[PDB]
Design a protein around this ligand. Sequence first.
Ligand SMILES: [Ca+2]
Ligand SMILES: [Ca+2]
Ligand SMILES: [Ca+2]
Ligand SMILES: [Ca+2]
Ligand SMILES: [Ca+2]
Ligand SMILES: [Ca+2]
Ligand SMILES: [Ca+2]
Ligand SMILES: [Ca+2]
Ligand SMILES: [Ca+2]
Ligand SMILES: [Ca+2]
Ligand SMILES: [Ca+2]
Ligand SMILES: [Ca+2]
Ligand SMILES: [Ca+2]
Ligand SMILES: [Ca+2]
Ligand SMILES: [Ca+2]
Ligand SMILES: [Ca+2]
Ligand SMILES: [Ca+2]
Ligand SMILES: [Ca+2]
Ligand code: NA
Ligand code: NA
Lengths: 417, 422
Amino acid sequence: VFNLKYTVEEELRAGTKIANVTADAKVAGFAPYLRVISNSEPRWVNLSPAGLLITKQKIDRDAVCRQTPKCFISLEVMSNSMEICVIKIEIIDVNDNAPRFPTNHIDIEISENAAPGTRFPLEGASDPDSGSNGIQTYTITPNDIFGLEIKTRGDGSKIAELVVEKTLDRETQSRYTFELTAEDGGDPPKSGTVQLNIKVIDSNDNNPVFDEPVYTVNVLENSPINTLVIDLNATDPDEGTNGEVVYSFINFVSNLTKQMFKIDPKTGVITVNGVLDHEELHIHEIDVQAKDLGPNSIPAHCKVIVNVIDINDNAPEIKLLSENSEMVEVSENAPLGYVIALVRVSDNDSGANGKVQCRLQGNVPFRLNEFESFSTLLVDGRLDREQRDMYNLTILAEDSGYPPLRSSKSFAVKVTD
Amino acid sequence: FNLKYTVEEELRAGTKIANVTADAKVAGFALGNRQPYLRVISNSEPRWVNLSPAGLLITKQKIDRDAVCRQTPKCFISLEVMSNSMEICVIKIEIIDVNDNAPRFPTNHIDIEISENAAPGTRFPLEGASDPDSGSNGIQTYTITPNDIFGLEIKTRGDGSKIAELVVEKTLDRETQSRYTFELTAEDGGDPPKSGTVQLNIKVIDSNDNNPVFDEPVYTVNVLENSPINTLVIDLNATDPDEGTNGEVVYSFINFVSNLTKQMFKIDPKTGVITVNGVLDHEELHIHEIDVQAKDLGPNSIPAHCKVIVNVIDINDNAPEIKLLSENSEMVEVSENAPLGYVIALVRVSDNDSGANGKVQCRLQGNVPFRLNEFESFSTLLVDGRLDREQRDMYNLTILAEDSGYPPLRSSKSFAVKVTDL
Ligand SMILES: [Ca+2]
Ligand SMILES: [Ca+2]
Ligand SMILES: [Ca+2]
Ligand SMILES: [Ca+2]
Ligand SMILES: [Ca+2]
Ligand SMILES: [Ca+2]
Ligand SMILES: [Ca+2]
Ligand SMILES: [Ca+2]
Ligand SMILES: [Ca+2]
Ligand SMILES: [Ca+2]
Ligand SMILES: [Ca+2]
Ligand SMILES: [Ca+2]
Ligand SMILES: [Ca+2]
Ligand SMILES: [Ca+2]
Ligand SMILES: [Ca+2]
Ligand SMILES: [Ca+2]
Ligand SMILES: [Ca+2]
Ligand SMILES: [Ca+2]
Ligand code: NA
Ligand code: NA
C-alpha cells in the first residue's frame, strides 16, 4: 500500500503521455490489470487499462492555483483485486502568463507643496504564475523628482508605493507623466507596463505683488466724474480663484477719499467719483489692498498719492475797507497822496493762477497804488469841488491765469473841506 | 510801517501782547493829540484779538492754534492800522504752538487679523494717531511692546508726518501660538513728550498646514470566522492639529481593495471604526489587507494611508464528511468466500476546517464482522469474520466520524452490503 510521484508541465496539449504505470508497478510493487476508483479533476487526467497515464487537455495551472508553490493532483488505483497505491502528479509552472495591469493607465492627484517624503500606495498587477515566475519588481521611468519604494509582503507579493523625493511646484511643472513597468522572474522575464499620469494641484502659495509700493500720479481739479486716475496691477501666478486678485480701499482714508474716488475691484482702476478741489485739499493718499480669492490669503498693499492740480476756477475778489463799503469821502483841500482807503486784492487759486493785478478805470483825479498785502488808494491832482461834488469810481481787477477772470467793485466818492 | 509780535496759544484773560503806542514812538510815528491814536481798519480774526483806544493790544480768548492751523509751521494774525492821519502800519502776530494736544488713536482698540503661513517680511499698514499740534509737538514715532516675533517700520513721508507699518519679523504658527496682544503707542516731540496709546490684536488664522499622522503604518488584529455583523475589527486613529474643518478627518478604503473586502467590512467615516459587514469565512479566505486612507476636510489637502491585516480564525463550523469510494453510492458487493483481508472499498475522511478542528477520527458501528483501517488521506474497508451467505446474505453497516474540535462535530454514512459466491 505505497506511493508514486510524477512531474508534468502545464499548458501542454491533450493526450501528452506522462507515464506507463504498468511497467512502474513492477519496478517496486505488485504484478483490466488496473481498475480506477478515485481521481481528482478527471477533466485533466484519464488513465488507460493498459497502465498508460495520459493527459486530457491544456492545463491552466495558473487558474486553478495561482501564486502558490507545489500544486499537485493525485489518484488511487487498485490491482487485479490486489493491494493498492497512490500516484501523485505535481504540475510544474511555466512563465506563460506575464504581468498585467488592470486599467491600461491610472490618473492620480497631488497637492503641490506636499512634503519631500510623502507617499502614495497604488498597487496593481497580476502575474498568476507562482514563485520565481511571479511578480518581483515594479519600476518608474527614472527621474530626479519622483522615486519608488517596493515594500515586500510577508507572503512574497511585492507591493509598491510612490514616494515624492524632491520639493514640488505647480507654477513650474503643472503635470508629469511616467511609464510604470512591472517585471517577472523567469529566465526570459516578461512584463507589461502602464502609463502614470500625475497632476500637480494648485496650492494658493503666492500672494498678490504690486509693481512698486507707492504710486505718485497728477490729476486736475474740478475733473469730470469717471475720469481716470490709475490702473493698478497686482500679480498672482496661482490658478483661477487662488490667483484672481481683487482690489479695495481699506481705511477710513479721509471720508473724502471714499466719495472722491471709486475703485473697480476686478481690475484695479482707480476712477474719479466726485468734485476734486485744490482749494478743499491739494494732495490725496489712498491705501489700496489687493488679495486673492483663495484660502490663506495674504493681502498685499500700496499707497497712491494723487497730487491735485490747480486750475483757474476762482475769480478775483475786491473788498473795500471802510465804514460804508459802498461809498467814502475826502477834502477839497486834500493834499498829495491822502490815503482815502485800503483794498484787498484777493485770490484763492495757486500762485500763477491767483496773482491779481488791478488798474483804475480811465483818466481820473484818483490814482491807485500797490503794496504787498493790500492796495493804497492815493489821490493824483486835486478837485476844485467848486463845480463837482462826487463821481462814482469802479475798480477793475483780473487774475493772471488762463482763461483769466475778472471782477469789479463800484463805489462812490464825494468831497468836503 | 511794519511791526512783528508773538503770543502763545491757549492764554486766557486777555493777556497783554504789546504796547504798540510805545513801539510806534520808539520807531517814530504820529504824535496825534487826538485820542484814538491808532485807528483799526483790518484784522484777520478780531474774535481773538481786540486793540485798545490807548494803543494797548490785549487778547480776548484762549486761542486754539491747533484748530485753525493744525500740523502747519506758521499761523499768523495780521492787522492794519492807519496813523492819526498820515501813514499806515502792518502788525503781525505769529501764534506760538504749545503741546496742549497729545496723540490720540480713533478707538481704544485695533483688531487686525493675520494668516498663519504669512512669511517673514510680510507687512500690514495701520492708521496711526491724531496730533493736531504743529512741528515737533506733532507725532514723531510709534512703538509696539517689544518682542521677538513682530516689529514695526515707521516710514516718514514728505508732508513731515510719520506713518507706521506692522511688519512680521519671524515665522508664524497657529498650533503653537494662536493669539498675540500688543500695545501700539504714539509719541510727541514735546518738552514733556506727550503720548497716547491703543491695543493691537493679531489673530493668527488657521492654514491647513498639517496632514494626519497614523499611530503606526501597519495594524494587524484578528477576528473569528462566521462572526456577526457590526462586531468591530479595529478602531483607528489619525491626528490633525489644525482648526475645525481643516482639522476634521474622515476615513476610508481606496483601491479596488478586493471586491470581497468591501463586501465583508464597513468603516465609519468619522471615527475610523472598521466594523464587520458579512459572513466572514476562513475556508473562503484566511487573511485580508484593508488599505485605509484618512484626509482632512479642507484646502490643498494631503491624505494619509495605513494597512490593516485581519487574520481570520478557524472555528469548528464545518462538519466532517464520509464519502464511500465505490461506483454504487449506497450498496457494495463481495463474495462469501473472502480471504480475511479483502479490501472491498475505500472511504474519504475529510474536513475543510484547518489544523485541529478538521482532523477526524472514525469508527464502525458495534460488533465487528468487518473492520476499517485508516491510512494517510483515506481509509481501507478490510474484512474480519468471513461469514456465510446462507444465514445472512446482507448486512446494513454504518460508519461514524467525529472531528477533534469543540463543539465537536460528527456525521455518519450507513450502507448495505450483500454477498455472492466465488
Ligand atoms: Ca496557464
Ligand atoms: Ca504558468
Ligand atoms: Ca509570468
Ligand atoms: Ca508653488
Ligand atoms: Ca494667490
Ligand atoms: Ca500655486
Ligand atoms: Ca476751487
Ligand atoms: Ca483752482
Ligand atoms: Ca483765480
Ligand atoms: Ca490748542
Ligand atoms: Ca497746541
Ligand atoms: Ca502733541
Ligand atoms: Ca502650523
Ligand atoms: Ca489638516
Ligand atoms: Ca494650522
Ligand atoms: Ca465556513
Ligand atoms: Ca472553520
Ligand atoms: Ca469540522
Ligand atoms: Na488691471
Ligand atoms: Na478614532
